[PDB]
Design a protein around this ligand. Structure first.
Ligand code: XA2
Ligand code: XA2
Ligand code: XA2
Ligand code: MN
Ligand code: MN
Ligand code: MN
Ligand code: MN
Ligand code: MN
Ligand code: MN
Lengths: 303, 303, 303
């Protein structure tokens, strides 16, 4: 029962600074102490210095390819995260990665699935994060990691991302909480038959049924390891106001944590990302910590 | 696939001014552009000038019969709306009427059912809007349109409302979202066996079951056209603060739009009212637009 | 159909003053008038003077046994409440007790079950209120009444509580709404197999199923009288901000009142506490009144 808390203070996936402060804020909130109380032997893993990285992010406007912003810096930092997370998983430790914007998932998902090839990925997000290189409008790479992970628009992915192993398949990723999906993304999810449970489905079936369906969708044998990549903007701005891309109307605070409890309950969680905490906009950070505690086993009654 | 956006800037059904600004605010928010994007060939229909009408509303205190306020002005303006909506439906266009207080529904429901006799009416509201002429306490006619439409308290309805066709029957109207029903209204709903799904039923069965039951209640053959008259005060003041008669605790923003999606889904929507937007109290107007988009086919994933 | 509104202005169960103002605030809000409208012949019962009691509470810091605060004052005041509530029930009247912090339930539960031995108790609360004398950390007795009622940690309950009849058994108490349960309390609920429906269960099954399961848990014959002790902090601080121990994320305003309607519906409610209203922190007091009205029969539609 060992855990590595992977610190990924990266902001180059989106315009706003402050999200790179995520990891330190979560840790100051007592994240590591929380995990130890739940019985986890923890250690911290520093992938890079957030301030040095932020310096290059803020300065280097020339880091563009087409509409895509910072593909070089992002490719470098996410390869670092990949190597770290992969080693953690090979060591037999649980990789709990704290972001940082969601572009870091390019490294975390690649890292985990390289060790666990049949791992399912549950993407908890208001967004699909699957815009292609030529398809993206904002050019913000935190809205693109799944397209790169899936190898979509192959001929337009820059050489600096050549390091990304092709280990994720469309039938191994399930969305929960979608409500701001771009037109291009809509077509992609449809064409690729990706399991997508939007807010419509949560409203229609309830969060318990949705989580069950999401788990089943990425675990046919019912035995597969499961990874969750958790964007805090899935949770309605009423609870998560300090996040870069707030969307209504999202998960309640209750649904957001219940989701974690159902996942913890299934006992097959192998890795977790908690991303897009931007402290410069207590609630957002305490929600991040709460997600961690519930995911890693904290319950309301005796266990 | 043609639509007429019927502008009904009327405020004479209730004391507060500002609700007559509804139509222009929704249009400035981009309502017409939204409908065109969804594939609708649209055009605007101006029934009357809201400023001229508001002038007579604010001045003419003598327009009273008993406790009922502005029965003459209301009867005149709603007859205009009736003739417009009826012609739109006869032209084979979808009447999307923007209010304006809910007294305009006297014209919209009469207009639609005169063309579609077997159309069901789903009344989304915190209130029953079915107080009679002699029964009303406030005397505000936006809380009375269904009594007139149903022909209740026949001997006490003023001659100026003689134009109203008797086309609505009690078994063709279903409420969703009730939580502030007057004692007299309670008795009426009971005595007439009107399908009424209060917040209790939403809490008990969930919004999906409630919407299903409401649709079934007004469509026995499962083939009948369906009209929705949507009062924005059904939605909890937390989401719709700028409305004349706010009531707790109502539909969530999510339930309010999910309702629209289920209706759009059934494919039998023939007309829609969006009423009681009072901008003088972004959320309320954007909610009004959102209701329209979801009702007319906008989905979270690919369609 | 007779009711006694038992006024229990007690604050000695917790540090904060103001909760003793509960009863008067609820009454000024029109609590008694509300009950009369619902058909109840009401009368007020003053157990003690809240100002005189508050005077001794604020002054007497020496009233401690170990970590437990004010065991003497609490034992005295709750014995008074016990004798009052017991007499009310023997008179054949409905005891509706307004607090006051939740330590008053030591008197109300004892009073009711002494007259109705097979009565079930539904404890609506964010907390378990079952910390023992030696187990409590805060030493606040409003978090301890159920341990005393159940006779737990027998050898450490002060002599001043010797008056408490042992009438409550573990299989006759059901929780609804738990989300802040101490580690010691968790073990107790588990060891004693007490029916506990946390926010997890509300999230998982919905409030209707939870209330049904709670009623069944304390009423095997399906005939037993039912008592509800309602802590207003069960309701999310968004609706109940003026309460001493606010916890997220709790019941919605809708769930909180729906709960009351289901209970009223079963027709076996024999007594009700409404506690922990602390006006010095309109919403909180109006919620208290609303709980009362819904519990005692108020419905959204005709009845
Ligand atoms: N996809 C985005 C954001 C990417 C989010 C990255 B994440 O915060 O890590 O999930 C990107 O920058 O690529 C934008 C693109 C433009 N849309 C516009 C929009 C607004 C409202 C609605 Cl309902 C819809 Cl369907 C679309 C918002 C997300
Ligand atoms: N019916 C009303 C409002 C009519 C609303 C028109 B609508 O905004 O278009 O739906 C009218 O003016 O005729 C009043 C009458 C007095 N009641 C008092 C009341 C307050 C709280 C509760 Cl829980 C209940 Cl049951 C009743 C409010 C609505
Ligand atoms: N049990 C309490 C409060 C008793 C409430 C009395 B009531 O307001 O009448 O229900 C007492 O003073 O005895 C405290 C003890 C310390 N816990 C700490 C805590 C905080 C958050 C969580 Cl999630 C958990 Cl599990 C525990 C809070 C309640
Ligand atoms: Mn994301
Ligand atoms: Mn997102
Ligand atoms: Mn209305
Ligand atoms: Mn209304
Ligand atoms: Mn309590
Ligand atoms: Mn409590």
């Amino acid at each position: 029962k060992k855990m590595s808390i992977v610190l990924a203070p990266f902001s180059g996936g989106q315009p706003h600074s402050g999200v790179e402060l995520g990891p330190d804020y979560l840790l100051k909130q007592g994240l590591q102490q929380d995990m130890e109380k739940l019985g986890w032997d923890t250690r911290l893993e520093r992938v890079f210095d957030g301030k040095v990285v932020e310096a290059r992010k803020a300065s280097d406007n020339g880091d563009r390819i087409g509409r895509v912003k910072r593909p070089r810096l992002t490719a470098e930092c996410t390869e670092k995260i990949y190597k770290c997370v992969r080693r953690v998983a090979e060591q037999g430790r649980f990789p709990l990665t704290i972001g940082g914007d969601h572009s870091i998932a390019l490294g975390t998902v690649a890292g985990v699935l390289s060790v666990h090839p049949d791992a399912g990925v549950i993407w908890v997000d208001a967004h699909a994060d699957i815009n292609t290189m030529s398809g993206t409008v904002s050019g913000n790479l935190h809205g693109c990691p799944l397209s790169i992970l899936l190898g979509l628009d192959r001929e337009n992915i820059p050489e600096c991302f050549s390091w990304v192993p092709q280990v994720l398949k469309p039938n191994k990723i399930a969305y929960i909480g979608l409500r701001a999906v771009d037109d291009e993304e809509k077509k992609i999810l449809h064409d690729l038959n990706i399991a997508a449970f939007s807010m419509h489905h949560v409203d229609r079936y309830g969060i318990d049924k949705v989580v069950s369906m999401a788990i089943e969708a990425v675990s046919p044998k019912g035995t597969e390891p499961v990874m969750v990549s958790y964007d805090v903007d899935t949770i309605d701005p009423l609870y998560v106001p300090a996040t870069g891309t707030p969307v209504r109307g999202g998960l309640s605070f209750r649904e957001a944590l219940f989701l974690c409890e159902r996942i913890a309950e299934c006992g097959r969680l192998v890795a977790l990302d908690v991303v897009e905490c931007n402290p410069l906009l207590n609630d957002t950070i305490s929600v991040g910590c709460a997600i961690a505690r519930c995911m890693m086993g904290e319950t309301l009654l005796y266990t």
